[PDB]
From Swiss-Prot:
The Protein kinase domain, residue ranges: 4-280
Primary gene name: CDK2
Protein name per its UniProtKB record: Cyclin-dependent kinase 2
EC nos: 2.7.11.22
Phylogenetic lineage: Eukaryota, Metazoa, Chordata, Craniata, Vertebrata
Enzyme category, top tier: transferase
Family, per entry: Belongs to the protein kinase superfamily. CMGC Ser/Thr protein kinase family. CDC2/CDKX subfamily.
UniProt keywords, alphabetically: Acetylation, ATP-binding, Cell cycle, Cell division, Cytoplasm, Cytoskeleton, DNA damage, DNA repair, Endosome, Kinase, Magnesium, Meiosis, Metal-binding, Mitosis, Nucleotide-binding, Nucleus, Phosphoprotein, S-nitrosylation, Serine/threonine-protein kinase, Transferase
CDD domains tied to this protein: STKc_CDK2_3
Organism: Homo sapiens (Human)
Matching PANTHER family: CELL DIVISION PROTEIN KINASE (PTHR24056), CYCLIN-DEPENDENT KINASE 2 (PTHR24056:SF521)
């Protein structure tokens, strides 16, 4: 750690404080992450992440385990999608750039999903952009390594906004579909300039999902009524038209979103199949206007 000089506090992540830091004796600028508990098993799983390299995955450069303390050194990105969407509120992100960001993010998912690694916690804070028109996923694989808590070490409530319905219904063996779901939510949010399901508790979150997409049953989601936190007494809401959900997203866009938001994780489109979707037919890579 004496090998690094703290430049500034970026924030408080799930796992602890995040610093922009500078490598005192190689000179590279990095994201320094202090992980708060290290168990042999978290070490082994994090070291696996070091080989999982893709241009749309924020590069894990190193894992320093010193003392009984855990530090992760990442490639530094200067902006996240939450800031970018804020800065972009009066007019919204142009759709060619939403299409690019989605297509790149699906590319990161397809890669990680092929080696069987999930994120499980995708959210605008975890998505990171550069001046090149790139977008990248931060913290991939870390949920499996450390858990996902209700509150950060600083008591910041962890958001549920992007959580998949099978997770909220207490399914314990969720798959890669969880990441598709979250990215769908994020996609709808970039398009409309509003979070899709801004829930402030598990039931509020689940009930916001239900209200937009219908209360799921055995027709749409075989096995649902038998999931741990399913209750027969859930209100039964009818599904809203998507044309009402994401104006002014075009037909290909709404079609794709709809497949990303399938209740049944087995019916939900994969990262791989989504890249072949007609929505990406005229995809381009514009350069954003970033203020740093
Ligand atoms: N280079 C990076 N900058 C960041 O800010 C990174 C990830 C991040 C940072 C804070 C909270 C959640 N994720 S990676
Ligand atoms: Cl920022």
């Amino acid at each position: 750690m004496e090998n690094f000089q703290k430049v500034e506090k970026i924030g408080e992540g799930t796992y602890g404080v995040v610093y922009k830091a500078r490598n005192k004796l190689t000179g590279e600028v990095v994201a320094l992450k202090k992980i708060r508990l290290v168990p042999s098993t978290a070490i082994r799983e994090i070291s696996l992440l070091k080989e999982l390299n893709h241009p749309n995955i924020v590069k894990l450069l190193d894992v320093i385990h010193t003392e009984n303390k855990l530090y992760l050194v990442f490639e530094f990105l200067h902006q996240d999608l939450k800031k970018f969407m804020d800065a972009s509120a009066l007019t919204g992100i142009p759709l060619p750039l939403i299409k690019s960001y989605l297509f790149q993010l699906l590319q990161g998912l397809a890669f990680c999903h092929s080696h069987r690694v999930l994120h499980r916690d995708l959210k605008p804070q975890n998505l990171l952009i550069n001046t090149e028109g790139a977008i990248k996923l931060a913290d991939f694989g870390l949920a499996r390594a450390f858990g996902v808590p209700v509150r950060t070490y600083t008591h910041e409530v962890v958001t549920l906004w992007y959580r998949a319905p099978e997770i909220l219904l207490g399914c314990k063996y969720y798959s890669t579909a969880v990441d598709i779901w979250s990215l769908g939510c994020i996609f709808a949010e970039m398009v409309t300039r509003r979070a899709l399901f801004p829930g402030d508790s598990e039931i509020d979150q689940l009930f916001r999902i239900f209200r937009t997409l219908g209360t799921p049953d055995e027709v749409v989601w075989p096995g649902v009524t038998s999931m741990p936190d399913y209750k027969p007494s859930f209100p039964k809401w009818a599904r809203q038209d998507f044309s009402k959900v994401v104006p002014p997203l075009d037909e290909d866009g709404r079609s794709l979103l709809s497949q990303m938001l399938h209740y049944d994780p087995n019916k939900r489109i994969s990262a791989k199949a989504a890249l072949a979707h007609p929505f990406f037919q005229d995809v381009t890579k514009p350069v954003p206007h970033l203020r740093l």
